[PDB]
Amino acid sequence: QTSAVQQKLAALEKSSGGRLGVALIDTADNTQVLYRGDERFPMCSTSKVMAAAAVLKQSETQKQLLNQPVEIKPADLVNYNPIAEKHVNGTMTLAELSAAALQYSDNTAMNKLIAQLGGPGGVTAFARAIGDETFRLDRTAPTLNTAIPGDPRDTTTPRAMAQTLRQLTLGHALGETQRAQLVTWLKGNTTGAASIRAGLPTSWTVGDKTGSGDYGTTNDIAVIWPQGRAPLVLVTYFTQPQQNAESRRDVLASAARIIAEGL
Numbered sequence: 001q002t003s004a005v006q007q008k009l010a011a012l013e014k015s016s017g018g019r020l021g022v023a024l025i026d027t028a029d030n031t032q033v034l035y036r037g038d039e040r041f042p043m044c045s046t047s048k049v050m051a052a053a054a055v056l057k058q059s060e061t062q063k064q065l066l067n068q069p070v071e072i073k074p075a076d077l078v079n080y081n082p083i084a085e086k087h088v089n090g091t092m093t094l095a096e097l098s099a100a101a102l103q104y105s106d107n108t109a110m111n112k113l114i115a116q117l118g119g120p121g122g123v124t125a126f127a128r129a130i131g132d133e134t135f136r137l138d139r140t141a142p143t144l145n146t147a148i149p150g151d152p153r154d155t156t157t158p159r160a161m162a163q164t165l166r167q168l169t170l171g172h173a174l175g176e177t178q179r180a181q182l183v184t185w186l187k188g189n190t191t192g193a194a195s196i197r198a199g200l201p202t203s204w205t206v207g208d209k210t211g212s213g214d215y216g217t218t219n220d221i222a223v224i225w226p227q228g229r230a231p232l233v234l235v236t237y238f239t240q241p242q243q244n245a246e247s248r249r250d251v252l253a254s255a256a257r258i259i260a261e262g263l
């Protein structure tokens with residue numbers, strides 16, 4: 001069936017010129033709204049959530065892991081390193097790297113998390129351990145953001161990512177302390193006000209992670225606490241046909257607005 005909300009999302013998509021993917025889980029009733037929910041999309045930096053979460057999971061059996069220092073060398077700096085570049089020839093702890101990756105989208109910090117997990121496949125292995133059979137991370141940053149149409153590397157589906165984000169932030173994929181830390185980090189994101197958040201009523205609370213890459217890829221994944229409603233999880237992925245396309249955070253905001261109006 002096609003719902004009214006799906007109809008509106010299809011109209012948004014057609015006016016956007018790109019390809020939109022949406023998955024909502026409403027934890028009031030566990031119902032779901034999906035638009036291209038089983039198509040693959042390039043995650044770009046939304047994959048940082050899974051990497052940070054995997055390190056949180058490791059910290060459940062090492063109480064001191066988040067205070068472990070990691071050396072930052074000049075050679076480690078990549079294309080976007082607003083926090084790590086201050087620490088070159090110095091160190092950052094795994095907590096500092098997780099915070100920098102999630103809240104500032106620091107790519108050097110992401111690469112340190114990936115290295116702590118043994119490479120991109122270690123992030124995929126964590127996804128599998130928590131029941132996500134779809135997610136794959138294949139490369140480090142920044143090349144995980146190439147976002148080439150049809151390329152399966154560094155992709156997931158909206159359905160899979162919404163389920164996983166729910167298990168991580170509202171469910172029991174992580175220990176209680178670790179879940180709370182992940183939620184605190186997401187809620188402190190600096191990069192999200194133009195994306196899902198822009199489509200929701202101001203009274204609602206959001207924790208989110210954005211992503212962007214080539215092909216005008218513009219993504220956001222969020223856990224939302226509506227005014228007076230049980231929490232939602234919302235994934236919005238958007239990608240375009242031309243490599244040099246501009247970002248379209250407004251399309252994500254419009255998707256979120258449609259979802260909110262449909263509740």
Ligand SMILES: OC[C@H]1O[C@@](CO)(O[C@H]2O[C@H](CO)[C@@H](O)[C@H](O)[C@H]2O)[C@@H](O)[C@@H]1O
Binds near residue numbers: 247
């Ligand atoms: O966007 C983060 C970071 O990436 C760079 C290239 O390393 O720019 C890319 O992203 C920009 C924003 O989407 C695009 O405008 C640009 O064309 C693309 O190369 C850095 O300039 C930027 O800080």
Ligand SMILES: [K+]
Binds near residue numbers: 214247
């Ligand atoms: K871009």
